Amino acid sequence: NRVFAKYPDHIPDYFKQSFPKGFSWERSLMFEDGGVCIATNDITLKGDTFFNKVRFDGVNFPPNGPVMQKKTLKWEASTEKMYLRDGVLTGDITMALLLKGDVHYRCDFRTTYKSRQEGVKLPGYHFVDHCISILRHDKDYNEVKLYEHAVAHSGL
Amino acid sequence: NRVFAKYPDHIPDYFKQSFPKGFSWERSLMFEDGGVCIATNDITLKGDTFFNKVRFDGVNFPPNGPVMQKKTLKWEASTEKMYLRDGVLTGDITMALLLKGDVHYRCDFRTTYKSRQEGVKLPGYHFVDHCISILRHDKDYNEVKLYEHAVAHSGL
Amino acid sequence: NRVFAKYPDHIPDYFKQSFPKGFSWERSLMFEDGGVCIATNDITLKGDTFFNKVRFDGVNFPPNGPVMQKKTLKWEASTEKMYLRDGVLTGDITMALLLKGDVHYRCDFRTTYKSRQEGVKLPGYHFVDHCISILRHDKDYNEVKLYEHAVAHSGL
Amino acid sequence: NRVFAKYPDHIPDYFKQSFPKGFSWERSLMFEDGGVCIATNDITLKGDTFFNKVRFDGVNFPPNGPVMQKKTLKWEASTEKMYLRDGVLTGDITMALLLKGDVHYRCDFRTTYKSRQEGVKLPGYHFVDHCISILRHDKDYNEVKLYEHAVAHSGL
Amino acid sequence: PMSLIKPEMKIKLLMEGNVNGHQFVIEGDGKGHPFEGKQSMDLVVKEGAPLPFAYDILTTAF
Amino acid sequence: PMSLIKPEMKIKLLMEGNVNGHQFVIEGDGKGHPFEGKQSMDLVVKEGAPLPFAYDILTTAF
Amino acid sequence: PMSLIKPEMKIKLLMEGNVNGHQFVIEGDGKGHPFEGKQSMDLVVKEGAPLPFAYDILTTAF
Amino acid sequence: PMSLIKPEMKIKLLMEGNVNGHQFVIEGDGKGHPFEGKQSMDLVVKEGAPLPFAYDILTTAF
Ligand code: NI
Ligand code: NI
Ligand code: NI
Ligand code: NI
Ligand code: NI
Ligand code: NI
Ligand code: NI
Ligand code: NI
Numbered sequence: 059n060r061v062f063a064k065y066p067d068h069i070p071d072y073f074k075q076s077f078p079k080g081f082s083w084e085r086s087l088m089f090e091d092g093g094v095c096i097a098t099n100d101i102t103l104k105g106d107t108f109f110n111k112v113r114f115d116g117v118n119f120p121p122n123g124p125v126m127q128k129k130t131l132k133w134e135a136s137t138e139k140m141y142l143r144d145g146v147l148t149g150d151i152t153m154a155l156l157l158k159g160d161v162h163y164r165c166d167f168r169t170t171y172k173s174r175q176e177g178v179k180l181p182g183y184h185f186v187d188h189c190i191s192i193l194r195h196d197k198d199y200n201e202v203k204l205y206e207h208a209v210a211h212s213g214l
Numbered sequence: 215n216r217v218f219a220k221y222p223d224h225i226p227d228y229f230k231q232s233f234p235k236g237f238s239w240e241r242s243l244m245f246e247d248g249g250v251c252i253a254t255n256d257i258t259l260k261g262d263t264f265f266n267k268v269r270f271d272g273v274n275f276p277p278n279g280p281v282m283q284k285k286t287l288k289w290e291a292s293t294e295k296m297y298l299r300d301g302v303l304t305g306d307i308t309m310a311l312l313l314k315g316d317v318h319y320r321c322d323f324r325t326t327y328k329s330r331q332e333g334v335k336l337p338g339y340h341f342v343d344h345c346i347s348i349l350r351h352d353k354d355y356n357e358v359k360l361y362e363h364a365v366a367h368s369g370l
Numbered sequence: 371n372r373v374f375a376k377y378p379d380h381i382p383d384y385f386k387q388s389f390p391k392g393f394s395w396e397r398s399l400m401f402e403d404g405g406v407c408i409a410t411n412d413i414t415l416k417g418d419t420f421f422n423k424v425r426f427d428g429v430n431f432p433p434n435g436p437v438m439q440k441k442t443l444k445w446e447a448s449t450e451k452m453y454l455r456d457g458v459l460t461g462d463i464t465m466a467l468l469l470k471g472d473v474h475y476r477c478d479f480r481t482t483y484k485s486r487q488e489g490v491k492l493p494g495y496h497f498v499d500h501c502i503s504i505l506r507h508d509k510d511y512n513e514v515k516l517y518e519h520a521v522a523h524s525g526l
Numbered sequence: 527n528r529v530f531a532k533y534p535d536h537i538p539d540y541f542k543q544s545f546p547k548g549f550s551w552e553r554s555l556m557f558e559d560g561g562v563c564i565a566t567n568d569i570t571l572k573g574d575t576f577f578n579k580v581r582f583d584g585v586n587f588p589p590n591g592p593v594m595q596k597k598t599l600k601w602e603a604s605t606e607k608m609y610l611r612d613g614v615l616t617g618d619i620t621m622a623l624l625l626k627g628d629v630h631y632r633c634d635f636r637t638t639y640k641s642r643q644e645g646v647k648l649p650g651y652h653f654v655d656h657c658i659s660i661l662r663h664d665k666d667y668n669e670v671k672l673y674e675h676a677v678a679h680s681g682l
Numbered sequence: 683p684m685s686l687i688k689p690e691m692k693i694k695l696l697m698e699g700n701v702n703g704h705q706f707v708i709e710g711d712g713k714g715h716p717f718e719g720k721q722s723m724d725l726v727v728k729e730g731a732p733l734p735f736a737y738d739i740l741t742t743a744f
Numbered sequence: 745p746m747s748l749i750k751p752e753m754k755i756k757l758l759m760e761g762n763v764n765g766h767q768f769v770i771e772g773d774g775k776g777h778p779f780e781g782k783q784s785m786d787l788v789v790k791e792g793a794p795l796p797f798a799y800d801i802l803t804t805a806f
Numbered sequence: 807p808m809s810l811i812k813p814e815m816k817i818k819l820l821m822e823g824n825v826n827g828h829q830f831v832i833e834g835d836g837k838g839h840p841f842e843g844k845q846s847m848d849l850v851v852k853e854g855a856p857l858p859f860a861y862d863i864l865t866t867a868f
Numbered sequence: 869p870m871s872l873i874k875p876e877m878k879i880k881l882l883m884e885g886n887v888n889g890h891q892f893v894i895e896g897d898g899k900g901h902p903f904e905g906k907q908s909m910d911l912v913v914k915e916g917a918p919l920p921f922a923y924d925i926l927t928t929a930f
Contacts, residue, residue, distance in 0.1 A: 064781030135681030213603030220719030291525030369447030376843030532905030
């Protein structure tokens with residue numbers, strides 16, 4: 059939910075403008091070993107609570123790969139490149155999972171964002187730095203405490 | 215359903231061997247303009263009828279692209295390259311949709327096949343020629359007559 | 371040199387039509403582990419001899435990967451998909467190198483062909499089966515005997 | 527030449543450590559419309575001057591595409607993700623060219639850096655913000671004034 | 683396994699999908715000749731009609 | 745639009761997914777500071793526990 | 807064009823390349839049957855011997 | 869290594885290239901401030917002028 063990203067005044071905030079009607083996003087996650095995931099989220103607002111209807115599908119992960127063998131440690135911080143593609147706000151990211159053994163596993167992200175709010179002002183090409191982290195979790199990850207910090211900027 | 219493919223005697227038929235327990239497959243469809251789809255099918259058998267539980271999800275298609283604008287005419291015939299990836303039968307294909315205006319729109323396919331039948335003999339690297347066609351359909355495609363012809367071979 | 375491909379009468383032969391002036395081709399080879407190669411060839415004709423001016427550049431191959439460690443055994447046979455991209459004859463191929471240990475290493479090919487002969491009749495979407503093989507070689511491959519068999523067809 | 531990048535004290539500077547022997551780099555540029563380029567540079571040092579032996583090859587660009595039709599305006603600023611791949615320092619980047627008509631044209635970069643200096647301390651996963659610009663040029667770009675600003679950081 | 687699949691088989695199918703936000707359901711009833719490598723099917727959109735995207739992207743999934 | 749989003753907001757989430765054939769459902773309850781660009785959430789696997797794949801692949805989808 | 811290419815043709819080739827920093831030159835002398843879609847060639851490394859990478863990556867470029 | 873690179877450095881460059889069949893040579897003369905992460909260069913096309921493609925594709929290679 060990119061609503062949770064610090065946007066400076068000089069960059070139109072597509073997400074905070076998308077209410078009360080809300081917005082949705084679609085994302086493709088292309089892993090370097092063939093794994094492919096599609097995630098979608100329809101975000102709505104009621105009172106002061108954002109509701110998220112998420113779907114996540116993943117296929118073609120090698121059975122002995124780092125994903126199916128649970129060898130990932132965390133996502134490294136990243137910088138999302140935001141721009142318009144055929145009129146749709148899009149974010150492309152060079153993502154990387156740190157694995158056990160001190161090596162990285164790359165994944166390419168492409169997220170498309172679509173607001174349901176009328177008259178939203180579209181931003182120009184910009185960036186959003188991210189850092190997502192699992193603060194703590196139980197043995198099997200049945201219970202997870204997640205956290206994200208994101209800041210939009212103009213690079214340079 | 216690759217069960218419907220003519221397999222020569224010298225190439226193990228992973229699919230016809232996968233019964234009565236059945237098999238499932240996962241597929242990623244990566245279109246050249248950013249569109250990404252994931253399709254899955256769990257195939258079972260009861261009597262002389264194959265049952266298919268299919269899920270299809272597609273995202274990131276440009277709104278004015280050939281897919282969302284319904285400008286496709288057909289898939290060209292193709293040749294699927296079958297091989298094992300980390301012990302899993304995989305089929306990679308260079309696919310192409312013919313569009314109005316006599317131009318092509320490429321899509322890369324990767325399908326992974328997983329049998330539930332024990333003792334299945336795995337094939338070596340081989341090929342499966344395909345030709346899928348919509349024989350007829352009503353105006354909005356609410357009703358479609360589909361057909362496919364597939365033949366496995368060793369190339370050369 | 372696609373001139374050495376058996377073309378049936380119903381498919382225009384872009385290559386055998388490209389003389390006496392000749393033609394050239396450019397190719398990108400994208401390997402699954404990051405290796406990227408670019409090859410080009412300018413083909414001319416003198417008497418009954420085809421002359422080839424070839425350039426080959428490769429980068430980003432992992433030092434311990436199958437290419438730099440010489441762990442490849444052969445290219446599997448393949449089927450090239452031929453079509454026009456922005457008016458230029460293009461061939462896309464799902465290629466795979468068989469490696470020691472009985473596993474495959476994928477590479478995606480895209481070749482563009484440009485004739486210098488005027489009035490060449492362009493072919494429609496079609497295929498070209500290939501089989502390239504090193505018939506024999508000395509210890510370090512300083513001397514290699516190469517062979518290729520190729521046949522164009524309309525699929526099915 | 528990543529030597530020209532502001533590195534903070536907490537991130538090992540692979541490039542400024544690479545002298546007097548120097549270093550080289552290889553890069554693949556994969557454009558969204560099929561264009562593929564390979565660039566290499568061998569950087570040496572003599573006195574207070576860095577010498578660069580550069581090779582650049584590009585193929586498969588659509589004849590009517592933005593590159594062959596000279597419709598690009600500039601590269602947007604970027605953030606390179608630096609990490610080790612099989613022991614080799616690698617930089618992956620989500621690059622984008624702004625085109626006339628206010629639209630973007632994406633290109634994925636992968637650069638591998640190899641120092642010739644012994645005992646170089648390798649950095650961990652990090653980032654390098656970039657901004658390259660053509661300050662001025664003559665009509666046909668026979669004469670170009672180029673400039674780049676780069677800053678390494680740890681994200682957040 | 684020694685396949686008992688017959689020269690003539692029937693096919694039943696149910697596809698649930700979502701493309702660019704458009705939800706739909708398609709049912710299929712077909713048949714085929716496994717050893718000939720040929721099959722055909724009658725497909726009907728049960729939910730989400732009319733589809734706002736190219737039907738072709740779905741066909742190899744049936 | 746002139747955003748009325750507050751400095752403090754709550755979050756409710758429901759994820760339905762399937763990875764390499766493994767079906768699961770995860771519920772989330774969190775909160776965040778929109779203008780600070782920070783958020784946190786408590787996630788619980790309601791169906792499909794224990795997950796047979798790296799939880800990390802799911803995190804940016806919450 | 808009405809092709810005058812003969813059933814038997816000869817081939818001369820010169821490849822200049824560089825892989826992962828290794829420079830090399832390979833000369834080729836061959837022949838083929840255009841209408842049968844077959845060709846063969848004798849390749850010799852003139853510079854850069856011995857090659858430190860898989861020769862197979864080069865073969866389709868001859 | 870303990871870098872002896874100075875706050876001010878000079879740059880000499882020679883690029884030989886070929887894009888979509890067009891051969892060219894570009895010479896560069898520049899300078900920069902390594903520790904400020906800034907550099908500039910004067911580039912001149914010595915062969916292949918005028919270039920028939922977007923100069924921008926070449927810039928990060930200098
Ligand atoms: Ni932990
Ligand atoms: Ni029709
Ligand atoms: Ni041998
Ligand atoms: Ni200008
Ligand atoms: Ni048996
Ligand atoms: Ni307003
Ligand atoms: Ni004629
Ligand atoms: Ni030291």
